[PDB]
Amino acid sequence: KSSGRELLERCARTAMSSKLIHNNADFFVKMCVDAVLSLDRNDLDDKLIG
Amino acid sequence: MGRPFIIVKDQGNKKRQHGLEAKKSHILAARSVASIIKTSLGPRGLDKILISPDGEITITNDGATILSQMELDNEIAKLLVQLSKSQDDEIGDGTTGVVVLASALLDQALELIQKGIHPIKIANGFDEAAKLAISKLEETCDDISASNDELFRDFLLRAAKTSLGSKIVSKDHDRFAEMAVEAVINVMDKDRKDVDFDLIKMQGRVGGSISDSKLINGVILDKDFSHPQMPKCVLPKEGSDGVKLAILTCPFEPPKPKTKHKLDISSVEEYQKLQTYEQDKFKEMIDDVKKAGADVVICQWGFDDEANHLLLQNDLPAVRWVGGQELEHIAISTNGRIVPRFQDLSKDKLGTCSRIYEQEFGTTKDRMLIIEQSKETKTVTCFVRGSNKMIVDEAERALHDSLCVVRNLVKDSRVVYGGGAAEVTMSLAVSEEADKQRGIDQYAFRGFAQALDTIPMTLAENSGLDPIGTLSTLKSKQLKEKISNIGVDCLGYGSNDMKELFVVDPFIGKKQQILLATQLCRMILKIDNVIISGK
Numbered sequence: 001k002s003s004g005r006e007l008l009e010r011c012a013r014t015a016m017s018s019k020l021i022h023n024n025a026d027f028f029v030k031m032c033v034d035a036v037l038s039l040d041r042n043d044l045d046d047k048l049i050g
Numbered sequence: 051m052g053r054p055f056i057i058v059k060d061q062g063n064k065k066r067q068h069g070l071e072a073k074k075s076h077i078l079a080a081r082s083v084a085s086i087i088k089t090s091l092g093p094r095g096l097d098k099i100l101i102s103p104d105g106e107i108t109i110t111n112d113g114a115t116i117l118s119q120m121e122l123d124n125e126i127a128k129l130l131v132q133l134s135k136s137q138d139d140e141i142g143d144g145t146t147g148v149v150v151l152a153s154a155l156l157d158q159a160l161e162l163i164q165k166g167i168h169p170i171k172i173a174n175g176f177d178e179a180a181k182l183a184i185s186k187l188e189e190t191c192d193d194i195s196a197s198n199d200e201l202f203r204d205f206l207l208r209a210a211k212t213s214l215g216s217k218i219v220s221k222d223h224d225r226f227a228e229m230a231v232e233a234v235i236n237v238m239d240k241d242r243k244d245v246d247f248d249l250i251k252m253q254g255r256v257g258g259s260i261s262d263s264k265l266i267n268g269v270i271l272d273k274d275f276s277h278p279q280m281p282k283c284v285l286p287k288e289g290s291d292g293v294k295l296a297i298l299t300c301p302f303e304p305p306k307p308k309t310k311h312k313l314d315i316s317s318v319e320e321y322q323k324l325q326t327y328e329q330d331k332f333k334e335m336i337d338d339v340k341k342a343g344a345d346v347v348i349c350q351w352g353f354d355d356e357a358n359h360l361l362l363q364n365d366l367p368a369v370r371w372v373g374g375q376e377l378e379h380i381a382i383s384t385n386g387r388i389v390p391r392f393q394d395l396s397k398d399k400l401g402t403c404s405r406i407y408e409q410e411f412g413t414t415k416d417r418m419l420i421i422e423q424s425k426e427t428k429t430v431t432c433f434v435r436g437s438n439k440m441i442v443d444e445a446e447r448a449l450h451d452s453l454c455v456v457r458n459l460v461k462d463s464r465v466v467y468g469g470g471a472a473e474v475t476m477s478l479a480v481s482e483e484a485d486k487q488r489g490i491d492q493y494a495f496r497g498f499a500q501a502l503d504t505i506p507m508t509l510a511e512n513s514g515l516d517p518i519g520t521l522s523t524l525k526s527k528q529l530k531e532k533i534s535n536i537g538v539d540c541l542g543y544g545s546n547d548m549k550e551l552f553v554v555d556p557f558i559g560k561k562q563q564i565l566l567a568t569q570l571c572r573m574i575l576k577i578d579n580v581i582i583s584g585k
Binding site: 022 | 174177178569572573576
């Protein structure tokens with residue numbers, strides 16, 4: 001019974017590894033996590049996040 | 051398995067670079083680029099000649115233009131070309147110091163790679179050390195926004211005279227600093243101020259001397275008047291000092307539809323009726339201007355031979371073959387609106403100009419339009435002269451970089467003292483935190499602190515001073531005394547204080563120097579396999 005917002009934050013920081021974001025992941029992870037929440041849970045699109 | 055071995059197409063032109071010698075080749079290559087512009091840093095810096103394949107030559111010391119329009123091969127130095135372009139676009143100043151600092155981070159990291167430290171572990175310490183340097187300079191950064199507009203005007207002069215000392219414009223810093231500052235003041239809002247660089251225009255002219263360059267508020271057009279015999283100067287009569295300038299995108303031409311049309315005429319009767327038709331159009335076009343009281347009319351397409359003299363008898367000057375972009379910039383300074391059609395012409399859309407005269411240059415044949423405003427207007431225009439075509443173009447980039455420093459103080463009033471004072475202040479902050487934490491990151495912190503010391507040692511080397519005696523003197527006054535105003539003096543004054551020398555640099559400009567250099571070298575250390583295809 002944990003929070004749904006903190007679930008997507010820990011999973012997003014894993015993909016930030018091996019990239020240039022690993023050091024800057026503090027500010028950058030807080031972006032993409034809020035990007036998927038704007039989209040509808042039923043329909044997720046990769047063209048809108050362009 | 052036979053003799054032919056093929057996986058990736060074109061294996062002959064594609065070469066693979068790997069190993070410890072790979073890091074040694076790309077780091078030492080980036081140093082040669084900064085070594086060229088190393089002598090170009092500071093007021094003692096020297097220019098560089100750039101030759102284009104078409105034969106046009108350009109002489110500039112700005113690292114943004116030097117790296118631009120230049121043929122390169124290695125991809126590491128091509129990243130430095132985009133590095134100086136990144137510093138030039140947003141900030142507009144400091145393109146030389148970023149490339150030198152970027153190569154200093156690689157030279158200090160080259161010795162750390164051979165010690166057995168992973169390249170990313172070297173770059174991870176640079177990101178943590180860059181945040182401590184910014185937080186230290188921000189604490190000592192003075193805020194000039196607490197003063198009024200009287201003291202703020204002199205604050206912009208300190209920032210302009212510093213950037214103009216490294217160019218050919220450095221001959222007179224006092225006279226040419228007012229042109230950059232006063233041009234910005236006109237577009238400032240006095241509250242929540244934005245520079246809006248779009249309103250500022252720069253038009254150069256090749257001839258005369260640079261001392262004849264003066265700031266004129268208005269629009270500069272190189273298009274001559276439609277008829278030669280109209281008077282050169284235009285002045286208002288009695289009251290209403292405005293000349294009622296009219297800007298019409300539609301010239302004087304026989305009305306025709308844009309689509310393809312065919313007009314069928316029957317014998318003599320309809321042939322004679324259309325004769326009077328067009329003859330009444332010229333009388334209709336001239337009555338609209340006289341009804342609204344307009345004087346000068348400008349348009350995209352040239353007037354007809356019958357329309358040229360029609361405006362002369364009514365004492366109505368006109369200019370033809372004006373570009374579409376030039377039409378929009380005129381209506382802003384005149385507080386007017388461009389008239390789309392002859393039926394929409396009204397006195398509310400007419401412009402206002404204090405004086406307009408017809409400029410002539412020497413023995414060459416040209417006519418330059420000069421619009422002047424007796425009161426503060428919305429736009430400004432830079433007028434630059436020079437004894438050489440390249441000096442004019444160099445004075446353009448010199449004045450452009452000066453306008454980029456002034457606009458940085460408009461958004462952020464926080465400024466720092468440059469000239470070796472800011473680099474040493476941020477360098478000693480990292481060295482103090484390296485001995486406290488110790489660990490395996492103490493070598494990455496010392497390499498970042500010694501890399502920041504390359505900038506003040508470069509300013510002292512080009513000025514003839516001893517880098518050993520200069521660097522040791524700065525660290526003594528910075529550690530003992532909390533005043534960070536002590537910095538490198540390239541001109542050789544008896545005092546090393548940067549505050550008494552009126553040297554002020556924007557904080558957003560010096561902050562991006564470490565940010566752009568640290569983020570670039572982190573990717574360079576992450577490059578192992580290098581595949582270069584021959585062209």
